[PDB]
Curated annotation (Swiss-Prot), chain A:
PROSITE patterns according to UniProt: NUDIX
Mutagenesis / variant outcome for changing residue 82 to W: Reduces affinity for UGUA RNA by over 90%
Modification sites for N6-acetyllysine: 8, 35
Site (Interaction with RNA): 34, 42
CDD domains the UniProt entry points to: NUDIX_Cfim25_Nudt21
Main location: nucleus
Its biological purpose: Component of the cleavage factor Im (CFIm) complex that functions as an activator of the pre-mRNA 3'-end cleavage and polyadenylation processing required for the maturation of pre-mRNA into functional mRNAs. CFIm contributes to the recruitment of multiprotein complexes on specific sequences on the pre-mRNA 3'-end, so called cleavage and polyadenylation signals (pA signals). Most pre-mRNAs contain multiple pA signals, resulting in alternative cleavage and polyadenylation (APA) producing mRNAs with variable 3'-end formation.
PTM note: Acetylated mainly by p300/CBP, recruited to the complex by CPSF6. Acetylation decreases interaction with PAPAO. Deacetylated by the class I/II HDACs, HDAC1, HDAC3 and HDAC10, and by the class III HDACs, SIRT1 and SIRT2.
Location of the region described as Necessary for interactions with PAPOLA and PABPN1 in the Swiss-Prot/TrEMBL record: 60-136
Name by which UniProt lists this protein: Cleavage and polyadenylation specificity factor subunit 5
Keyword Acetylation applies: yes
All residue ranges annotated as the Nudix hydrolase domain in the record: 55-177
Family that this chain belongs to: Belongs to the Nudix hydrolase family. CPSF5 subfamily.
Lineage of producing organism: Eukaryota, Metazoa, Chordata, Craniata, Vertebrata
Length: 203, 195
């Protein structure tokens, strides 16, 4: 009866399976402390390291679930108001995906689980030892101080995480992130646009 | 590296392309009111409006620029338009590209870059489907269109084709709208080669 069809290229249509938020639960592991204690000290360390080992390379993972067919991104919350993606700083000679895998495990990994990381979703660059970041390398900037790379991390149907005691794991709908740098910063707030190309299935 | 981890794209100078001039193209709707009425009437007929849009990119001194169509001082748009019922999205975009930028006298489209959704017969659009919206009235799909090394475009008299740098678009929703101004973000995953 039926004819056999191709296969669409995954560049044209990238399909991702999403599962209920209630399929994902977490436990508690030992606290993970911030290396820097202030915004002034954060850019001092960044400056000190740049003179020695060059541009900082950070990688971040975007984990997506659904609740009633609405995509939600998983975020780490430190002390109510500071939201972040799981991820961090690569070591100087470290591969990007392997690095993110190590950092994903450090921050979310159970203690008794392999990460599927096959999609780059965007890049952000920091021209100066200062807050501003851009989804491009700004004109005339030859040595940016940080390169931040974002990846989509696909979840299995069910996952159990272990989260450092000082953090909470939350789930934010794309409509709460959209146009909301005050609440989530310029990177997390633009995930709705960065994620708009994926064809999500709601399982 | 897999194409899902690294898309490498070839960019060429803006001096590798010329503009031509053909006959004026006029919009199917004569006003803003009339534009949202036709959408209403057609949704009754054939359902959700399907539109497709192309992002054509060049470089100027190692800097990426998006090609936009300008309708006099303030109004900017991407090349694209409405698909016919049951039309292939990529073939439809190719038809619409030629209708706009092709002359009287060969588009490479391999990447989807974004999706936008219109919940009501009104201006606001979103890069996701809003809560409780089961019937969006328009679905807009965006593709990176890959340019040949050199090309000749034909631009209708009432339009100007302009090359907009990404820094001009970024965080400039009032100048360019929520879609055009978010193209820097949508293009950030690509690895551009400046030939």
């Amino acid at each position: 009866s039926m004819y056999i069809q191709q296969t669409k290229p995954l560049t044209l249509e990238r399909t991702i399976n999403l599962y209920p938020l209630t399929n994902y639960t977490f436990g508690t592991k030992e606290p993970l402390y911030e290396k820097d204690s202030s915004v002034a000290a954060r850019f001092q360390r960044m400056r000190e390291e740049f003179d020695k080992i060059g541009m900082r390379r950070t990688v971040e993972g975007v984990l997506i679930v659904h609740e009633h067919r609405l995509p939600h991104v998983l975020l780490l919350q430190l002390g109510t108001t500071f939201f972040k993606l799981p991820g961090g700083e690569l070591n100087p000679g470290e591969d990007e995906v392997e690095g993110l895998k190590r950092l994903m495990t450090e921050i979310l990994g159970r203690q008794d689980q392999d990460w599927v990381i096959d999609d780059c979703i965007g890049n952000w660059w920091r021209p100066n030892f200062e807050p501003p970041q851009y989804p491009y390398i700004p004109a005339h900037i030859t040595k940016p101080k940080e390169h931040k790379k974002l990846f989509l991390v696909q979840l299995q149907e069910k996952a159990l995480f272990a989260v450092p005691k000082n953090y909470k794991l939350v789930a934010a709908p794309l409509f709460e992130l959209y146009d909301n740098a005050p609440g989530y910063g310029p990177i997390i707030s633009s995930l709705p646009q960065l994620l708009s190309r994926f064809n999500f299935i709601y399982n």
